[PDB]
Structures are given as C-alpha cells and as structure tokens.
Design a protein around this ligand. Sequence first.
Ligand SMILES: CC(=O)CCC(=O)O
Lengths: 260, 261
Amino acid sequence: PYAAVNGTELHYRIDGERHGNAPWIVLSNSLGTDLSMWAPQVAALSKHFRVLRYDTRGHGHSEAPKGPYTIEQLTGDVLGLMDTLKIARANFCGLSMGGLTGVALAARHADRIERVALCNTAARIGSPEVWVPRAVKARTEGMHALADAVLPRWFTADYMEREPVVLAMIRDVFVHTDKEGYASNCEAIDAADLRPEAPGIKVPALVISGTHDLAATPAQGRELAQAIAGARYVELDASHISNIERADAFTKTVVDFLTE
Amino acid sequence: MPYAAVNGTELHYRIDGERHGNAPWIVLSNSLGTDLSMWAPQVAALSKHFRVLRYDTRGHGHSEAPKGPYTIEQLTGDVLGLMDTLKIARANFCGLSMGGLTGVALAARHADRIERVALCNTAARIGSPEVWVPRAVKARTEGMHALADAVLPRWFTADYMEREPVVLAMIRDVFVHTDKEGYASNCEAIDAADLRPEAPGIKVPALVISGTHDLAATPAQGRELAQAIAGARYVELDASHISNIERADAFTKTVVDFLTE
Ligand SMILES: CC(=O)CCC(=O)O
C-alpha cells in the first residue's frame, strides 16, 4: 500500500477495525527507522483505534524526493495521507522527528488532530554540530558507516547486549535507509525550530522523554511540556527509542492518555 | 527500494557486504509468512565472509503476489532469475523451512549454480495436505490475523515468546500483513512439493539444521534429509521452528563455520 501525496509516494500500513468505527491514531517514525519501529504498540493501539503507520519521505519503502526537506513538507505529507484516506481528524503519536512533526501539526492544524503524544523529541532537535556532519557522512560514506555511531544513542548498552535480534532488525532498517533521503531529513530537522509555536498547541498533549536519551533530552521534553498548556510530561527509563526498550510502559502511557 | 522483474514477477531484494567485492555470494531464503527482516541476526556475521543476498519470496513482504497457486518451480526460478539479474554465477544458499525446501530443489536441479547449502528447519516434504489445505482456506477466507494465533506459537518455544515480546510483535507484524492470497498460494506450493526422491541426487556439501522443538519440520525429518544427501551433516539446535532467531548466536556460528570450512 502506497499513496501519492504531494507528488511523493508514501508507503503506509493500516491496522485495526477497518469496517469499524474507532478513532484514528497516526504514528510518525524517528529518523533512520521505518514503520516496523511501531510493531510493539500495534496490538494495544488496535484495541482502541484504527492505526495508520507510514514511512516518512526518504525512508523505508517510501519515495526519496529531492531535498533538502522541510518541516512543512513533513507536515504536509501527513495531512495529504489523511486526505487520501479520508481521515478527517486523528490522534497523533510521533517519535523524535515524528514528535517534531506532531508539534507542527498540533500548533498549526488542530482541526485535524485530536490528541498529540510527543515522544523522545524536542521543539528544536539537536544543532548544526549534529546535523551538518551527519548529512555529509550519510552522503559521502553511506549509512553503514553511520550506524556504529548512531545506534548506541538509541538504546542503552545493556538493552543492546540483551537484545541482539531487536538491535539487528533495527540496525538493518537504518543501514538500508536511502542515504540522500536520510541526509535531506537531517536538513529538515536542523532547519526546524518550533519553539516559537509550541505554546500555541491547544489540544491535549503528552510528552514522553527517556532518562538516558542524549539525542533529545529530559530537559528538552520538560521545556516542550511546560510550553504547552495542560501538557503532561512522562519520563521513561529508556534512551532514545523508548517505545522499544520500554515497550510496555510506553504503550500503557500512550493508550491511557489517548483513551482519556 | 531494490526490485527485480524476474520469472514473470517482481521481487524485493537486499544486498549486504561489498557488492562489487570478490567474496563468495550467499543467498538466504525465507520461511512462509516472513520477509527478509527475519535474517537480520545473521547479516553482520555473514557480511564478513560473503556478499549477502536476501529477498522477499513471491507473495511476501514487498514483493509482488502474482496469481497462484505457486509451484516449487516458480520458487526455484525466482532465485535463479534474481541471481541472473545480479550477474551472480554461483552462491552458497541458506534457506529456512520453505526456504530450505527451495534449497533442496536448487541443490538437486541446479548444482552448478550452488556452492554449499544450509537447509534449516526444513524437510524434503514439509507437512501434509491435512495441514496445508485448511491453512490456505483459512488464510483466503478469514485473513491473516486468525492464522497468526495458530501459526506463531509453532515458531518459538513458549518461554522465548514470553521473554521476547518485541521480537514477537515485529515478526507478527510481518506475518499479519502478508498478502493472504500470496500466503495461501505458497501453502499450495509447499504441499505439492515432495522433493524426497530428488534429495539423494544432491552433489554439493550440505548442512541440515533442525530445532528439537520444531513440530512444523521435525528433527526426524532433518535426519532423513541429512541421510539422503552424500556427505551432508546434521546439527540440532535447542529451538523450535524459527531457530535462526530463537538461537541466533548458535545458528549463525553453525552456518558460518560450515560455509567457510
Ligand atoms: C511459516 C508458516 O506460516 C507455516 C509453518 C507451519 O507449518 O507451522
């Protein structure tokens, strides 16, 4: 399944009661992942929602158009996807760059968003010292070279040692991400600072951060939550891909929040 | 992502290791209801010694699901057409379940295309009409969620499943999103393939890996397979049917030492 959205082709995947009547949840992935990263949440979510997952532009089985990409393109893909599938309004749960997209969507397109879960993210993620070298390395050396540095930021060393099959699966998706699509998203993320509009988010919002997350910090998640009136901040004992390392605690947090 | 139009279909494939290097090739072939992510625990170790080709079997993953039923000849020709497309002249081959079955066909009917074969959680005749006929009906008329609850417990021991809920969820996600017609047509292929008369004809070094808890393809069938094949060797792992996941480390080691001996 693929949807032509902005003259760009996105791979997507639906779970839950299709004939049924349940609210939608849209899930939005981290840089260097694909929609498989949400597999631990799919069962619980499916009990309450129709679930829409997709591969972000430049990722997974989606197209990689010419970059640099921008936050507005990443926001527009989600809206266009929902347009295509005739989803008038949905809950939204995004991780890292997925959370950043959630910020833009919630601030600017609340008529399309019911509730927002903003996970392992910040209103402004990283800095040019992170994103510029990362995009050069991606472009000039390929993704295999990048995995060694990036993957340790995603999971604690204990989790990786204990779970070499999960790590190998996640690493395989990262290392096979289109290097240009990857760099072009590095550019979108670096260019995006949504700090000015976080305070304009008026939908119910949950911010999840990982205690051990160095890519988007607990301080950043608290800053994001404090900007949003009524936002709830939850910290998990995890690093950056918290929905995997702490799947049960993540899933329970998000489901409880969304079914309020 | 990479696709090749081959044998009258389109297959999604993936290459690891230096693709223009000089290391021998290895082609991996997946189980029914999986996609090429199932071999992710082996990729790192095999990339050290080999150029690695993985692919989504027809009806699976991101490959096309053409009109079924499928046959063991379509499945074999798929591997061959992919190799041909990549200019791969010969390769080691490691297949799990229907992948191991494909590997028996390939090693028997295409010895010159094959270096060494690892035939994993498999048999020269897998299951029986009493399993495959209702399976195909169920997949086609009820969809894959229904099948997942019956099939998945046959792939891992209870304890692994309890200990490894993230691995299970990811494997289940691929299984439940398999095209149902694609899956049923492969059921038909496997049920029709009885490679037992052809196995004694295999001329290349073979390794047979079986899981002591595998009910879908048994140790006993693993031994018969190994005994049909001149010089084949048999190794049994403390696992059920998807042994390259449940006992990844031992599986990897076994396959690597055998293929590089
Ligand atoms: C791989 C599959 O879907 C069936 C295997 C079995 O007979 O249990």
